[PDB]
Design an enzyme around this catalytic site. Structure first.
Site, mmCIF file in Angstrom:
data_model
loop_
_atom_site.group_PDB
_atom_site.id
_atom_site.type_symbol
_atom_site.label_atom_id
_atom_site.label_comp_id
_atom_site.label_asym_id
_atom_site.label_seq_id
_atom_site.Cartn_x
_atom_site.Cartn_y
_atom_site.Cartn_z
ATOM 1 N N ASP C 58 5.664 -8.706 9.031
ATOM 2 C CA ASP C 58 4.478 -9.549 9.008
ATOM 3 C C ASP C 58 3.421 -8.962 9.934
ATOM 4 O O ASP C 58 3.720 -8.599 11.075
ATOM 5 C CB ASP C 58 4.834 -10.975 9.429
ATOM 6 C CG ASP C 58 3.721 -11.971 9.152
ATOM 7 O OD1 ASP C 58 2.603 -11.787 9.675
ATOM 8 O OD2 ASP C 58 3.964 -12.946 8.411
ATOM 9 N N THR C 91 -2.820 -11.002 6.795
ATOM 10 C CA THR C 91 -3.104 -10.406 8.096
ATOM 11 C C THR C 91 -3.044 -8.883 8.040
ATOM 12 O O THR C 91 -3.930 -8.198 8.567
ATOM 13 C CB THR C 91 -2.129 -10.948 9.136
ATOM 14 O OG1 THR C 91 -0.800 -10.912 8.604
ATOM 15 C CG2 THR C 91 -2.484 -12.379 9.492
ATOM 16 N N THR C 92 -1.991 -8.335 7.434
ATOM 17 C CA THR C 92 -1.904 -6.887 7.267
ATOM 18 C C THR C 92 -3.091 -6.349 6.479
ATOM 19 O O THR C 92 -3.728 -5.373 6.887
ATOM 20 C CB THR C 92 -0.594 -6.512 6.578
ATOM 21 O OG1 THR C 92 0.506 -6.810 7.442
ATOM 22 C CG2 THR C 92 -0.578 -5.035 6.254
ATOM 23 N N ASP C 392 5.060 -18.142 5.265
ATOM 24 C CA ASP C 392 4.155 -17.428 4.367
ATOM 25 C C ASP C 392 4.194 -18.020 2.963
ATOM 26 O O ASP C 392 3.152 -18.272 2.351
ATOM 27 C CB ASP C 392 4.512 -15.941 4.332
ATOM 28 C CG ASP C 392 3.923 -15.166 5.501
ATOM 29 O OD1 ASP C 392 3.274 -15.788 6.365
ATOM 30 O OD2 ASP C 392 4.107 -13.933 5.554
HETATM 31 N N1 ADP Z 1 5.654 -6.776 -6.857
HETATM 32 C C1 ADP Z 1 4.447 -6.276 -6.505
HETATM 33 N N2 ADP Z 1 3.897 -5.245 -7.179
HETATM 34 C C2 ADP Z 1 2.700 -4.740 -6.835
HETATM 35 N N3 ADP Z 1 1.957 -5.204 -5.815
HETATM 36 C C3 ADP Z 1 2.384 -6.236 -5.055
HETATM 37 C C4 ADP Z 1 3.686 -6.839 -5.366
HETATM 38 N N4 ADP Z 1 3.872 -7.824 -4.473
HETATM 39 C C5 ADP Z 1 2.785 -7.849 -3.661
HETATM 40 N N5 ADP Z 1 1.901 -6.899 -4.003
HETATM 41 C C6 ADP Z 1 0.604 -6.649 -3.331
HETATM 42 O O1 ADP Z 1 0.807 -6.189 -1.996
HETATM 43 C C7 ADP Z 1 -0.250 -6.667 -1.162
HETATM 44 C C8 ADP Z 1 0.249 -6.941 0.250
HETATM 45 O O2 ADP Z 1 1.242 -7.959 0.200
HETATM 46 P P1 ADP Z 1 1.715 -8.740 1.526
HETATM 47 O O3 ADP Z 1 2.313 -7.757 2.501
HETATM 48 O O4 ADP Z 1 2.510 -9.949 1.104
HETATM 49 O O5 ADP Z 1 0.340 -9.296 2.139
HETATM 50 P P2 ADP Z 1 -0.119 -8.805 3.592
HETATM 51 O O6 ADP Z 1 -0.248 -7.315 3.438
HETATM 52 O O7 ADP Z 1 -1.419 -9.521 3.839
HETATM 53 O O8 ADP Z 1 1.015 -9.259 4.473
HETATM 54 C C9 ADP Z 1 -0.782 -7.926 -1.822
HETATM 55 O O9 ADP Z 1 -2.207 -7.866 -1.895
HETATM 56 C C10 ADP Z 1 -0.189 -7.937 -3.217
HETATM 57 O O10 ADP Z 1 -1.233 -7.964 -4.190
HETATM 58 MG MG MG Z 2 1.633 -11.298 2.475
#
Ligand code: ADP
Ligand code: MG
Ligand code: ADP
Ligand code: ADP
Ligand code: MG
Ligand code: MG
Lengths: 523, 307, 529, 61, 530
Positions: C58, C91-92, C392
């Site tokens: 996270d 956040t990332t 989340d």
């Molecule tokens: N199964 C998947 N296939 C392709 N892209 C994905 C998948 N799951 C999530 N993503 C993409 O990865 C990005 C980052 O996801 P996540 O790490 O949950 O959010 P954050 O980076 O804000 O923590 C999201 O914008 C999402 O669109």
């Molecule tokens: Mg996320």
């Protein structure tokens, strides 16, 4: 060792002390010289508490920096003075004082006496005041568009300039709601009754001024309503708990039933308080002190929503907003003390916290400005800018006189002083004309911070201001060109510019009078 | 016999507390593990009000440890008798919080009180009959000021019928120890007068002088513990507002001196409004300082009523 | 310099120094957090100064746990903290977009372009991008299947795939249970209890409540079938009088009478409870459970056990509401006039001991508007990770419900917004077109990092994706198993419209302010001492 | 040199209320003359400030 | 050019004493090395021929044991990956009670083979995929490897033969005696309901004599003396009070307010008459033994002696609760005589001296009850603590058998069969997962390898013999420790068996721990406090 004064008492004196004071002052000036105008840049200050202050505000910067030279201390103090008095001009004043001391350094090196320089400065200050009052214009404060333009002309130089319309409307609404009159005494207290609550997250474009107040509070008991559409509100300074007496009220029990009788008497006291409250048939009860669980029980039985521990300031704002009167003895409660005027009490979850809204009031003489944005730092800067805007609106509503900005006023006054100096035949004409030319630093700084040619533009401007009806001509802080302020729209409050000039000239006078520093001696 | 829960906040509090919980443990035979390596039965006579025996005859203390900065609770774990405590009674944040009362008492470490409160409930539940709480903190300094009063506050809201016996390190007169100590201490006294039932003012200056007399930083936490046990090892507070004490060997009116000092340094700084932007820009209204001042002139006059 | 002539021990970063410092710190944060992004990201281990272990993917947790003392890093951590407090996710991506905006702006500022002009381009591009986002958002009836896809898109990034497939159904059912039509979702009404005994895939949704405590009387039953639940906030332990009282007696007999009398006050409340119990349960068929927010002394516990009541003490101020919403009774602060309508029903109540801790399950309620997520796992750090993941996921589903719209994921919206910004750029007056181009190349960091983390060539994959989106116009993103473009709306990869909007807004704002910083200065006391 | 020692619980309520009614009566006596401005060297509890507010007077402590 | 500067970014922004590791080399391989060192520290204690270790903790306390979880607890493991493996081992100890050393060995082996696979060129993701599918296959296989079942847990010969194996790894020389003792205790306290509580087996460690003098006692033993003059009772009518054995006083401050010489003269006599009445009511209820959780007053003790009541004071509240469970009584918070149901009974209550120690024994004559005690004799406190740990292993094995009655052959037989079958599954599974499946299989070989190495024979010859016999078809064959040369024999016919649940949970937890250690890719340690 046979000394007369204690060791560590060091005494400097003379032109070294004078030049040192003047250099310290103009250094304080050079610190924030670039924070003036619409095209200024932010500065990231590091607090002693691990905090950060990202700002353009001269007083914020000088308040966050620390110095040891007493002249620099005095300059920081006059910046604070300007901020507390008018709430704007905190760096214009610093720059003007620095320039005045700089030009006085000349006459001091040339054997002129500081008292002569000071008398000349005071003459020039009086004539500056006269010229500003002559070139000022009035304002119809009923013209919301005129007021919005004044507030834009005051916040355009700050980060919120991107949301200028929003911030202007917020500030105007807040000040017009805080405007209050009682017993023939008008009072705009935008420090106690215009509240800024910064909730990080969301977007700034949803920031608003509420027709009411907002506090970070929840109901005392989850059976209490969180939504009331015409709440009658009661405010209290007293605890609805059973507390001890002021005297040594020690009891002595010998009978069996007496202990239980005492506990039941406590319960009956709480019941009687809650009945004294219910007799007014309120919907909401708000306390600055605690509320016992039995009191919560009785209020809920009466279908009343309670909020337990509010701050005295928040309670005063709730009073002003909903039309209530804080009480301290529910026996002394009257219908006139009950709060009718609030149009809605709502308690909604913003993020993971519960906030109580008392909004939709009619004629609320207090308000809460709910700021939303990216982070605590961005919202602190937005709050400071909104403080500036509201202080400018207040200054206008108090003194409806306006003067032109963009350095137009500075150039007009400099020209008027140069014209008046031709009748002077003594030796003070030179420092007088010197402060006159020392007023040019404001347009000079504007040109420098926009990135244009100071020499050329200031020459063209000094030439424009030698014509007859050209005292409104100034400079753009965004393009580096001369414009008419009647056409641009940058108009400052006469009160603001008067306080600026006065504080600058008096700071110069003080630091010129100063000589012979002494130090070391311990209180 | 009813049980007493012991919260300790801030560096000063977390470092008085460990020493207290060591003095008493040795006064009861409990070793660092928790085993009762003792013979007398008077050590077990009144051991239920301080220790919460578990299965295996390991007497865990009824102590919570709080600070916004983990590095003090790490030094407490690593220190001596740093293992009797429950590995879940250590509640800490990540932000240092500096020495700002507003920072500790507001949103800048406010959610944590909601992590120390679900440990106060999880520590009261074990208690058969909860006598009350004993909070050890510092009047003005680091988090102990802000967080030590938002704790007295939220624990007087959540358990409003129990003894709240505070042990606060009142600031020494000679040593300023901080630039905002006058503010933090008037703001904290303004809460302790209301939400407290008995306060023991432990002056670092006097404690240091006593240590020097004994000789003829740890030494102060070792000269405050024997007093904390002479107060909590066995007719006071006639008036429910003059509940401040000066231990020794005292409900003296010499407290009035300390309070006069604090309120005159508060008024000196408040006149020039020095170090006020932080509080206003972080969640105080400029009127809470006037209220604090008023209430300290109140206290000083209540104490001046006798002589 | 100027500040250093007045405060000699002052640190200052001016004009170019300031910008280099800020951009360097931002890029450092981006370099750390690049690996968190997406389900193919890598888990970081974080060890406290005490030795406690955290396994996290996270962005906010990683930020706050990293060991950093940089002003720009603090600024960006605060922006991420606000993003997390309001939306729960993003956040990332927030940190990544900030870092990439700063980098793409430095690209043009090193060539003498002014950061003010770059920020004008940033604001124009932000406006157009928000418009395009509102255009592409998919307004959908939020059915269980859509919510399942959303929660999957979040939980698969935050935890392992099988555990994500479990937490998905758990979270979606929990929210669909505590949710009332047209009534903001109170996530407080979803308790989250962690148990540390079984596998992490045993995490379940209890259609009821789980209290982290049990009965304190041994003779009290450990299992109750048809239970009347009495939620109370009334002290059942010994209460002393407010005013100092004291007892005075002349004989041991009088002392005994006073000892018996001093408890009459609490005995009366116990008698009221017992009379209600007898009135509602005329036999041993049903059960009766008292749950007190306050204490219960051993005498009251004995008195209730004798009558067959299960009494829990020192419950939580939130459990009061959670019990009144799950069971369905009324929470009481007094037993003045208590009636059978004040009681709730639970089709089962029992106790579970785990080492030194006890748990109480309250299940088989009729239609509980409050539930609990039981986080089971073998390690404290596993439990913490699942807690973060379910936070989340709950925030994600709540936001997808609130905003009836939902935005495609996998960088599809970022690609499309980049293309739209590049087609809009000529309409911008002056050299703010360069700020617009920088904004577009910054938005393109999400698909780029997704490919980089799935193990593909950033440029080749992005070229494929942009080509497919330009020829067809379909919103396509990265397929993390083949590196090919894929339609996120068809494959079920969804993002939160609120999260994307918050990203755009807050990232633009903080990047603008950082670019406009021209002097970093530490000239204060430097400590409060 | 004065202590309250109760041996009949029925007196506690009246004693506690008298503790405030004394000051209430003093304030009413002061306000009955027409005093709208009240300067004090000592303190003024909130209970008293509320009396001044309801009377429309200006009190200073 | 004489100093390498920290790179711009995270390397510069990092705090002073903080560390950052990233990548296979700096993070994954170092974690695998740490876990390997841990497994090596605990390998030599595995099995009946496993040797003991004497760990001294920071408190200068001595532990002499070959119990893996105990050794791990008393070591100061500071590497985080090793800490995670220890967390897995402790979770195994909590869930099952035995198999912690299996968890350690298996996790270390899985991690070593994972390092090997990463070096040959697989990615952590593929290794984890293969490990998970192979753990699933092992869980699918083990139920088919189950050979025998308990079939009765109320007997004492069957239960002893079943616990002997679990109590053989610890205390190899003398295990038949200990299995007899633990079986007696477990089946005494085993109720007609299928629920079995491990806290109802109490262990009293008394100095003097030796383990062959140990015994089981249907009741309770307290290293206490009696408060009064009575020391023995033959038909106990125990009355238990959580309150002190004194006159009740007020929770509010009580004051004896005297106003007349008559009241002053009569107060103490009235107090004594009251105490006499209270204790006489208790004695007249028939109670001959009183057990108070609080203190005893001098007058109450006087009158208890007068009325011939044995007084016992149990300082602990757990002790009071367990005595209540033992005797069938109810702790009364008042000094009121108990009703016929609140009273407890024991066939005898007496004061004895086991060795130098004085003890109070609540002894039932019936061969049942809610609580049973094992009195451990021994010449050393460390020896008696080790025997107590062995008792804990046996009791947790009994509970595991109450939960799931299925048993698998020990001495490495199940491990070898698992290795064989998972290898045969990986040889059929295509794709890059087969490498990880085959390494997961080979990891099981670490168990008979560790057994052989500690037995004192060539592990390679042992493993080859085992593979040959399990290929020809004998799934219950494992290694013979009673053989100077590498040998093998029928584990079932020998009676060396493990618990299906034990193996299940050990495999699951070891695999999860290894997989987490592998899933770690970056480490950001903070400055070690201290
Ligand atoms: N199964 C998947 N296939 C392709 N892209 C994905 C998948 N799951 C999530 N993503 C993409 O990865 C990005 C980052 O996801 P996540 O790490 O949950 O959010 P954050 O980076 O804000 O923590 C999201 O914008 C999402 O669109
Ligand atoms: Mg996320
Ligand atoms: N758009 C503009 N163009 C030119 N001058 C401006 C503009 N906006 C404001 N000014 C001038 O800049 C001066 C200072 O602006 P500001 O920075 O708000 O005050 P200070 O310098 O005291 O902080 C004002 O006197 C005003 O006349
Ligand atoms: N008599 C025996 N012959 C061969 N192997 C045995 C014998 N007794 C026990 N074992 C083996 O010893 C192992 C138990 O070792 P132990 O030290 O108990 O490890 P853990 O406590 O982790 O289970 C079991 O796998 C079992 O197969
Ligand atoms: Mg301004
Ligand atoms: Mg074993």
């Amino acid at each position: 060792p046979v000394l007369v004064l204690s060791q560590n008492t060091k005494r400097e004196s003379g032109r070294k002390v004078q030049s040192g004071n003047i250099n310290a002052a103009k250094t304080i000036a050079d610190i924030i010289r670039t924070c003036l105008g619409p095209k200024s840049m932010m500065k990231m200050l590091l607090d002693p508490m691990g905090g950060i202050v990202m700002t353009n505000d001269g007083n914020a910067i000088l308040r966050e920096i620390q110095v040891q030279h007493p002249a620099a201390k005095s300059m920081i103090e006059i910046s604070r003075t300007q901020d507390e008095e008018v709430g704007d001009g905190t760096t214009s004043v610093i720059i003007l004082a620095g320039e005045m001391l700089s030009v006085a350094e000349h006459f001091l090196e040339q054997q002129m006496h500081p008292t002569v320089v000071i008398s000349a400065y005071r003459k020039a200050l009086d004539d500056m005041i006269s010229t500003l009052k002559k070139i000022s214009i009035p304002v119809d404060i009923s013209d919301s568009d005129m007021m919005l333009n004044i507030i834009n002309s005051s916040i355009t130089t700050k980060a919120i300039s991107r949301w200028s319309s929003l911030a202007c409307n917020i500030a105007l609404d807040a000040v017009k709601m805080v405007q209050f009159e009682e017993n023939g005494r008008k009072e705009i207290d935008i420090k106690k009754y215009a509240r800024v609550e910064k909730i990080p997250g969301g977007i700034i474009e949803d920031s608003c001024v509420l027709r009411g107040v907002m506090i970070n509070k929840d109901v005392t008991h989850p059976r209490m309503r969180r939504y009331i559409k015409n709440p009658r509100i009661v405010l209290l300074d007293s605890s609805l708990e059973y507390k001890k007496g002021e005297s040594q009220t020690d009891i002595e029990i010998t009978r069996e039933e007496d202990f239980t009788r005492i506990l039941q008497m406590e319960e009956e006291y709480i019941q009687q308080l809650c009945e004294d409250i219910i007799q007014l048939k309120p919907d909401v009860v708000i306390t600055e002190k605690g509320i016992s669980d039995l009191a919560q029980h009785y209020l809920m039985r009466a279908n009343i929503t309670a909020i337990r521990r509010v701050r005295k300031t928040d309670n005063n704002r709730i009073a002003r907003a909903c039309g209530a009167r804080i009480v301290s003895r529910p026996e002394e409660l009257r219908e006139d003390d009950v709060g009718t005027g609030a149009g809605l009490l709502e308690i909604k979850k913003i993020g993971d916290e519960y906030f109580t809204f008392i909004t939709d009031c009619k004629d609320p003489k207090a308000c809460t400005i709910l700021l939303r944005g990216a982070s605590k730092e961005i919202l602190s800067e937005v709050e400071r800018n909104l403080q500036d805007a509201m202080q400018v609106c207040r200054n206008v509503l108090l003194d409806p006189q306006l003067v032109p900005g963009g350095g137009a006023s500075e150039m007009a006054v400099a020209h008027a002083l140069t014209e008046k100096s031709k009748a002077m035949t003594g030796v003070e004409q030179w420092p007088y004309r010197a402060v006159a030319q020392a007023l040019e630093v404001i347009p000079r700084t504007l040109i420098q911070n926009c990135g244009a040619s100071t020499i050329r533009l200031l020459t063209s401007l000094r030439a424009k201001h030698t014509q007859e009806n050209c005292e409104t001509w100034g400079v753009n802080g965004e393009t580096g060109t001369l414009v008419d302020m009647k056409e641009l729209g940058i108009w400052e409050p006469l009160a603001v510019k008067l306080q600026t000039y006065k504080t600058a000239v008096e700071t110069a006078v003080l630091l010129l009078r100063i000589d012979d520093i002494v130090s070391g001696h311990k209180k | 016999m009813r049980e007493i829960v012991h919260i300790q906040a801030g560096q000063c509090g977390n470092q008085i507390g460990a020493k207290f919980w060591e003095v008493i443990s040795d006064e009861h035979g409990i070793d660092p593990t928790g085993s009762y390596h003792g013979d007398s039965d008077l050590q077990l006579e009144r051991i239920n009000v301080y220790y919460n025996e578990a299965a295996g005859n390991k007497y865990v203390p009824r102590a919570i440890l709080v600070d916004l900065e983990p590095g003090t609770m790490d030094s407490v774990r690593s220190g001596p008798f740093g293992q009797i405590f429950r590995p879940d009674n250590f509640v800490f944040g990540q932000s240092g919080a500096g020495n700002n009362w507003a920072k500790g008492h507001y949103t800048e470490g406010a959610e944590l009180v909601d992590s120390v409160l679900d440990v106060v409930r999880k520590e009261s539940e074990s208690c058969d009959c909860l006598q009350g709480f004993q909070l050890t903190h510092s009047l003005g300094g680091g988090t102990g000021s802000g967080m030590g009063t938002l704790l007295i506050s939220k624990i007087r809201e959540e358990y409003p019928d129990r003894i709240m016996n505070t042990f606060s390190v009142v600031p020494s007169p000679k040593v300023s120890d901080t630039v905002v100590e006058p503010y933090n201490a008037t703001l904290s006294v303004h809460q302790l007068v209301e939400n407290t039932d008995e306060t023991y003012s432990i002056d670092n200056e006097a404690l240091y002088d006593i240590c020097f007399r004994t000789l003829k930083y740890g030494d102060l936490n070792h000269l405050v513990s024997a007093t904390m046990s002479g107060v909590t090892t066995c007719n006071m507070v006639p008036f429910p507002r003059l509940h401040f004490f000066m231990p020794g060997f005292g409900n003296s009116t010499a407290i009035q001196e300390l309070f006069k000092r604090i309120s005159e340094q508060f008024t000196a700084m408040f006149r020039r409004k020095a170090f006020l932007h932080w509080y206003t820009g972080e969640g105080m209204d400029e009127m809470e300082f006037t209220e604090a001042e008023s209430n300290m002139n109140d206290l000083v006059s209540e104490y001046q009523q006798y002589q | 310099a100027a500040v250093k002539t007045l405060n000699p021990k002052a640190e200052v970063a001016r004009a170019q120094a300031a910008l280099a410092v800020n951009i360097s710190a931002a890029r450092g944060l981006q370099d750390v957090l690049r690996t968190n992004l997406g389900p193919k990201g890598t888990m970081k281990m974080l060890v406290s100064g005490a030795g406690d272990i955290k396994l996290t993917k996270d962005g906010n947790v990683l930020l706050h746990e990293m060991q950093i003392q940089h002003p720009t890093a603090s600024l960006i951590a605060k922006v991420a903290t606000a993003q997390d407090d309001i939306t729960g996710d993003g956040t990332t991506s927030n940190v990544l977009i900030i870092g990439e905006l700063l980098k793409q702006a430095d690209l043009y500022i090193s060539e003498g372009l002014h950061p003010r002009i770059i920020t004008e381009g940033f604001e124009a591009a932000k406006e157009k991008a928000l418009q395009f986002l509102e255009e592409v958002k998919v307004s959908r009836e939020m059915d269980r299947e859509t919510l399942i896809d959303v929660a999957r898109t979040s939980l698969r990034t935050k935890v392992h795939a099988e555990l994500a497939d479990v937490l998905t159904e758990a979270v979606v059912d929990s929210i669909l249970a505590i949710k009332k039509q047209d009534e903001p979702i109170d996530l407080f009404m979803i308790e989250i209890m962690e148990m540390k005994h079984k596998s992490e895939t045993d995490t379940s949704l209890i259609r009821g409540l789980v209290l982290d405590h049990g009965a304190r009387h041994p003779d009290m039953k450990k299992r109750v079938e048809d239970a009347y639940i009495l939620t109370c906030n009334v002290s059942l332990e010994y209460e002393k009088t407010e005013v100092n009282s004291g007892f005075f007696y002349k004989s041991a007999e009088e002392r005994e009478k006073l000892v018996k009398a001093e408890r009459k006050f609490i005995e009366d409340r116990v008698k009221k409870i017992i009379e209600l119990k007898r009135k509602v349960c005329g036999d041993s068929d049903k059960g009766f459970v008292v749950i007190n927010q306050k204490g219960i002394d051993p005498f009251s516990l004995d008195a209730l056990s004798k009558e067959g009541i299960v009494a829990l003490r020192r419950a939580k101020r939130r459990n009061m509401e959670r019990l009144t919403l799950a069971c369905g009774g009324v929470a009481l602060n007094s037993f003045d006039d208590l009636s059978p309508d004040c009681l709730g029903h639970a089709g089962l109540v029992y106790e579970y001991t785990l080492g030194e801790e006890k748990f109480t399950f309250i299940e088989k309620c009729n239609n509980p508007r409050s539930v609990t997520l039981l986080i089971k796992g073998p390690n404290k750090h596993t439990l913490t990770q699942i807690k973060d993941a379910v936070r989340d996921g709950l925030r994600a589903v709540k936001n997808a419900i609130d905003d009836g719209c939902v935005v495609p994921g996998a960088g599809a919206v970022e690609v499309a917004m980049a293309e739209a910004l590049i087609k809009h750029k000529p309409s911008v007056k002056g050299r703010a077109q360069l700020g617009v181009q920088a904004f577009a190349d910054a938005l393109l960091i999400i698909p780029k990092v997704l490919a980089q983390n799935s193990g593909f060539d950033l440029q080749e994959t992005l070229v494929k994706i942009q080509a497919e989106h330009s020829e067809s116009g379909q919103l396509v993103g990265v397929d993390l198993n083949t590196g090919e473009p894929m339609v996120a709306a068809e494959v079920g990869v969804w993002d939160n419209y609120c999260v994307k909007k918050q990203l755009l807004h807050s990232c633009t704002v903080i990047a603008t302010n950082i670019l406009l910083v021209d002097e970093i200065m530490r000239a204060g006391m430097s400590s409060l001492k | 040199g004065v202590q309250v020692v109760i041996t009949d619980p029925e007196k506690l309520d009246q004693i506690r209320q008298r503790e405030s009614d004394i000051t209430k009566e003093r304030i009413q006596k002061i306000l009955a003359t027409g005093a709208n401005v009240i300067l004090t060297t000592g303190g003024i509890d909130d209970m008293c400030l509320k009396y001044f507010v309801e009377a429309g007077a200006m009190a200073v402590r | 050019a004489l100093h390498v500067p920290k790179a711009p970014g995270f390397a510069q922004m990092l705090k002073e004493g903080a560390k950052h590791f990233s990548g296979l080399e700096e993070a994954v391989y170092r974690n695998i090395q740490a876990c390997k060192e841990l497994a090596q520290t605990t390998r030599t204690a595995y099995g009946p021929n496993g040797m003991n270790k004497m760990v001294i903790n920071h408190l200068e306390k001595l532990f002499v044991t070959n119990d893996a979880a105990t050794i791990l607890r008393e070591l100061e493991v500071q590497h985080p990956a090793a800490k995670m493996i220890v967390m897995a081992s402790h979770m195994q100890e909590q869930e099952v009670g035995d198999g912690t050393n299996f968890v350690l060995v298996f996790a270390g082996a899985l991690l070593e083979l994972a390092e090997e696979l990463l070096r040959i060129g697989l990615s952590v993701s593929e290794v984890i995929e293969g490990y998970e599918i192979a753990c699933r296959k092992a869980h699918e296989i083990l139920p088919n490897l189950v050979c025998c079942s308990a079939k009765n847990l109320r007997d004492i010969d069957e239960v002893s033969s079943l616990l002997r194996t679990s109590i053989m790894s610890k205390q190899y020389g003398n295990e038949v005696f200990l299995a007899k003792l633990i079986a007696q205790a477990c089946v005494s306290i085993f109720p007609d309901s299928g629920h079995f509580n491990v806290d109802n087996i109490r262990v009293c460690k008394i100095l003097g004599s030796g383990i062959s003098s140990s015994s089981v006692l249907h009741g309770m033993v307290f290293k206490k003396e009696t408060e009064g003059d009575v020391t023995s009772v033959k038909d106990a009518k125990i009355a238990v009070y959580s309150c002190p054995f004194d006159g009740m006083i007020t929770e509010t401050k009580g004051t004896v307010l005297i106003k007349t010489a008559e009241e002053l003269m009569n107060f103490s006599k009235g107090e004594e008459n009251l105490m006499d009445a209270q204790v006489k009511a208790i004695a007249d209820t028939g109670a001959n033994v009183v057990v108070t959780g609080g203190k005893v007053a001098d007058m109450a003790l006087h009158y208890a002696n007068k009325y011939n009541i044995m007084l016992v004071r149990l300082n602990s509240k757990w002790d009071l609760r367990r005595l209540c469970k033992t005797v069938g009584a109810t702790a009364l918070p008042r000094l009121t005589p108990p009703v016929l149901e609140e009273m407890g009974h024991c066939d005898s209550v007496y004061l004895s001296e086991v060795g130098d120690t004085q003890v109070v024994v609540f002894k039932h004559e019936k061969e049942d009850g809610a609580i049973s005690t094992i009195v451990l004799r021994g010449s050393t406190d460390n020896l008696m603590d080790d025997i107590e740990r062995a008792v804990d292993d046996g009791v947790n094995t009994f509970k595991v058998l109450t939960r799931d009655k299925r048993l698998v052959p020990g001495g490495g037989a199940t491990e070898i069969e698992l290795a064989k079958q998972i290898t045969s599954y990986g040889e059929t599974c295509p794709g890059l997962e087969q490498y990880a499946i085959k390494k997961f299989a080979e990891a099981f070989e670490a168990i008979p390898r560790a057994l052989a190495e500690n037995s004192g024979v060539k592990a390679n010859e042992v493993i080859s013999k085992l593979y040959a016999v399990h290929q020809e078809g004998n799934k219950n064959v494992g290694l013979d420790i009673e053989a100077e040369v590498p040998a093998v024999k029928d584990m079932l016919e020998a009676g060396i068996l493990d618990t299906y649940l034990g193996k299940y949970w050990a495999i699951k937890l070891a695999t999860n721990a290894a997989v987490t250690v592998l899933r770690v890719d970056q480490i950001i340690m903070a400055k070690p406090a201290g």
